[PDB]
Amino acid sequence: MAWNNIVFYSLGDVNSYQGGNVVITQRPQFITSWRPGIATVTWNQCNGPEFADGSWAYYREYIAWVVFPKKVMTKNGYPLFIEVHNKGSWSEENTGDNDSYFFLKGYKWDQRAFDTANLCQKPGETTRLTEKFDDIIFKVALPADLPLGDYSVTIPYTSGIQRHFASYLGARFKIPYNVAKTLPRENEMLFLFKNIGG
């Protein structure tokens, strides 16, 4: 029978970005970059063989994901409104969700492969993801009642690659958006700025 194995490899990079001194009318920006590194399985769904031994054909479909919040609360209890400034080539999907942005990039599909590989790594197992993807530039709208002073906002978010292995040519799968937005948010963008007022 036909089989499909899908595994989500989660990246866990911590980065920071300085917005500097801002007046309340500014939309200061921050850049999120994709850093190749070690990723951990945080989700899978498999019904096929556990691994390929280098002698038989299977098919690959890989899709990169970034799931980012639309609103973040400061530690003093105020909302910061996150807006997309420049998403590059990313596919911005499921735009009606009120809480999260979904950025996808399907970069490999229908690729026949033979070589040895674990086709269904379990949660907590790791691999090195060598892929590089485009930056995403966001901008922040501050509420007019934001208290004056220093802000250091930790924005947790999910980024990683969905790897789909199948027994046939033409195989397609996408992790449901509501599962993707409930995946561990292992990346962090620490946005630093100071509210000078208005």
Ligand X SMILES: COc1ccc(O[C@@H]2O[C@H](CO)[C@H](O[C@H]3O[C@H](CO)[C@H](O)[C@H](O)[C@H]3O)[C@H](O)[C@H]2O)cc1
Interacting residues toward ligand X by CB under 6 A: 61, 63, 91, 104-106, 109, 172, 174
Q: How far is the CB of 146 from ligand X (least distance, A)?
A: 36
Q: How far is the CB of 162 from ligand X (least distance, A)?
A: 10
CB 7 within 8 A of CB 44: yes
The torsion angles phi and psi of 8, rounded to 5 degrees, stand at -105, 115
Cβ proximity to ligand X: between 27 and 172 the closer is: 172
Residue in the shown chain whose Cβ atom is closest to ligand X? 106
Q: How far is the CB of 84 from ligand X (least distance, A)?
A: 16
- CA 97-46-91 angle, to 5 degrees, is 30
Token pair in block for residue 52: 């390929």
Interatomic CA distance for residues 36 and 109, integer angstroms: 20
Residue 9, number of CB atoms within 10 A of its CB: 25
Interatomic CA distance for residues 172 and 162, integer angstroms: 11
Cβ proximity to ligand X: between 91 and 116 the closer is: 91
Cβ proximity to ligand X: between 116 and 178 the closer is: 178
Cβ proximity to ligand X: between 91 and 126 the closer is: 91
Q: How far is the CB of 129 from ligand X (least distance, A)?
A: 17
